[PDB]
Symmetry: C3
Subunit: 114 residues, 3 copies
Amino acid sequence: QKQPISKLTRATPGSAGLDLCSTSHTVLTPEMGPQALSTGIYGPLPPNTFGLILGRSSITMKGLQVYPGVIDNDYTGEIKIMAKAVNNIVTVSQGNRIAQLILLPLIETDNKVQ
Amino acid sequence: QKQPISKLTRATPGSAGLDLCSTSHTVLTPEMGPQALSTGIYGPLPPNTFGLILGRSSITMKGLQVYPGVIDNDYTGEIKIMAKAVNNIVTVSQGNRIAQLILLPLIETDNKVQ
Amino acid sequence: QKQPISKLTRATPGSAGLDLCSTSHTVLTPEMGPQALSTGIYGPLPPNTFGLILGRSSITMKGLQVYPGVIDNDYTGEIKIMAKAVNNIVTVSQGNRIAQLILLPLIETDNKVQ
Ligand SMILES: O=c1ccn([C@H]2C[C@H](O)[C@@H](COP(=O)(O)NP(=O)(O)OP(=O)(O)O)O2)c(=O)[nH]1
Ligand SMILES: O=c1ccn([C@H]2C[C@H](O)[C@@H](COP(=O)(O)NP(=O)(O)OP(=O)(O)O)O2)c(=O)[nH]1
Ligand SMILES: O=c1ccn([C@H]2C[C@H](O)[C@@H](COP(=O)(O)NP(=O)(O)OP(=O)(O)O)O2)c(=O)[nH]1
Ligand SMILES: [Mg+2]
Ligand SMILES: [Mg+2]
Ligand SMILES: [Mg+2]
């Protein structure tokens, strides 16, 4: 906060995603349903791109589901992770990488804005 | 019905997704599991693109999960939204925007058709 | 095993995804939560691409959720499908197509590797 996406890092040079961590310690239970986790990272995105927030596989396998999120090109708010404990109680420590941002080309169309 | 994807609209000029609404009022409960919601919008998609159906974040946070769906380039059927109430009873009013279509480049490969 | 992604096939010429089958018969129950299903298919991916593993819609509607998975460009391990039975007991027969691989352009950025 406020940190831009240029501050994120890749696990490795060939990693498709930029890792996202929560800035808070959060405990999630299945009955809580979707929770929006703060990242302290803000849009916007590089020109002609949009973002997809996806889970990391190791986190998904530990029972924390990240719902795929679309980040619009010109979003300037805080990127949050939408997360749910699937079956069990899940504990997110401050700073642990819990999702990833993928950048994709934004295709232009003639669809109207409405 | 039958309406083509060119009829969809963007929330804003920089919105990555084209919004999809259900043409029916639908109530979903968790025990129902995945339901396919009618949109009255039909493929196919622009040349060299395919589609991804994703949830809208505000709808996801209200407890309606949209399962990511792939729309093939030459699909000419009705685009449906695969949806589930996560934890609670969810009510979809006719016309409310419940998902979004994202267009992505379709990469060509030499993989066989089988 | 070890089979490369070039061995996968498309349902049809205009299908966005390359189908993935499990090499094992697997039974899944909701209380099991996420399971990683073996495919016997291995990265890496074509240059300048990364992969997304998504469910097939017919499988999603039958109550088997595939969590979207990111496949890094230079991953050389086995591509596994992360799957959960949503509400009911689901049975995956050996060889049935249970997910699909989508290839997408890998955008280069100046983000650091850390
Ligand atoms: O996982 C997410 C998804 C969205 N977002 C932010 C960025 C995105 O540009 C913004 C809007 O997201 P979506 O459109 O999915 N949401 P919705 O349609 O409900 O809001 P709007 O009508 O403003 O587009 O919410 C996140 O921070 N995390
Ligand atoms: O959310 C979705 C997903 C798919 N679809 C439609 C468009 C897509 O081209 C078509 C086939 O989808 P998938 O392949 O995911 N499905 P499946 O592999 O089960 O059917 P097929 O063997 O015909 O490809 O179903 C939707 O309408 N909504
Ligand atoms: O559904 C999936 C997701 C990932 N994978 C493999 C390929 C991918 O390159 C590798 C790493 O995946 P992610 O990064 O999502 N995982 P995580 O961040 O937990 O591991 P790492 O720190 O190595 O990137 O796991 C699959 O086989 N199936
Ligand atoms: Mg990773
Ligand atoms: Mg929106
Ligand atoms: Mg298919």
